[PDB]
């Protein structure tokens, strides 16, 4: 629940803002992508240093690097799948938010 694994910010009809982390979107394909990215990082490390091994830090960094590239888990406007999570919540989901010369702002 730390704010290092923030994924999405959802504002409901009630106006309650909730941070949905990766825990609510851990699909198996996402785990596969995490493992593949970690293995690619291992390739880079072994070709940079030469030591034939895989570090835990590789997977730990791949965890946060997984969502640096979009996985299609968030959607524009209100997703139908979100209307399903909204039904479980009991509050309609209204705002999905990832985590000039127009007047004067102070």
């Amino acid at each position: 629940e730390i704010d290092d694994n923030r994924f999405l910010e959802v504002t409901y009809a009630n106006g309650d803002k909730e941070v949905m982390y990766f825990k609510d979107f851990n699909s198996g394909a996402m785990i596969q992508n995490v493992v593949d990215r970690a293995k690619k990082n291992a390739i880079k490390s072994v070709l940079e240093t030469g030591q034939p091994g895989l570090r835990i830090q590789h997977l730990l960094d791949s965890i946060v690097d997984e969502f640096a590239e979009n996985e299609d888990l968030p959607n524009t406007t209100n997703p139908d799948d979100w209307a399903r999570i909204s039904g479980k919540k009991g509050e309609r989901i209204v705002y999905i938010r990832t985590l000039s010369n127009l007047g004067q702002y102070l």
């Binding site: 992508n33 593949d36 990215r37 997984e66 590239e69 979009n70 996985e71 299609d72």
Partner: protein
């Protein structure tokens, strides 16, 4: 090599079919899928997801130096040259061609 060009024109649609075919051809590592698109912003990030099309490479315009290179590739040394222009370089055809390429590139890049 299976190459696709002008893929910014396209992308519930044909995208899932393309992804399924790419996953099917993934077993054939010898076949290399190469896509081209001048508008990376319009390309649907679904194809940009990790996995299939991981490697993205940017390309650039011909730089002055690249223009001199490309001009040399067509304006080779075997093309006929004027005698008066040879008088400025004592009959050195390669040097004359290089100077002419430099001159035309400089004028066009001015």
């Amino acid at each position: 090599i299976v190459f696709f060009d002008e893929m910014d024109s396209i992308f519930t649609t044909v995208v899932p079919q393309l992804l399924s075919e790419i996953d099917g051809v993934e077993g054939l590592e010898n076949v290399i899928v190469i896509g081209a698109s001048n508008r990376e912003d319009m390309i649907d990030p679904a194809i940009l997801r990790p996995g299939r099309l991981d490697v993205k490479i940017k390309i650039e315009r011909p730089d002055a130096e690249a223009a001199q290179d490309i001009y040399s590739k067509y304006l080779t040394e075997f093309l006929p040259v004027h005698a008066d222009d040879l008088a400025e370089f004592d009959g050195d055809r390669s040097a004359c061609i290089k100077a002419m390429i430099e001159k035309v590139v400089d004028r066009m890049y001015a």
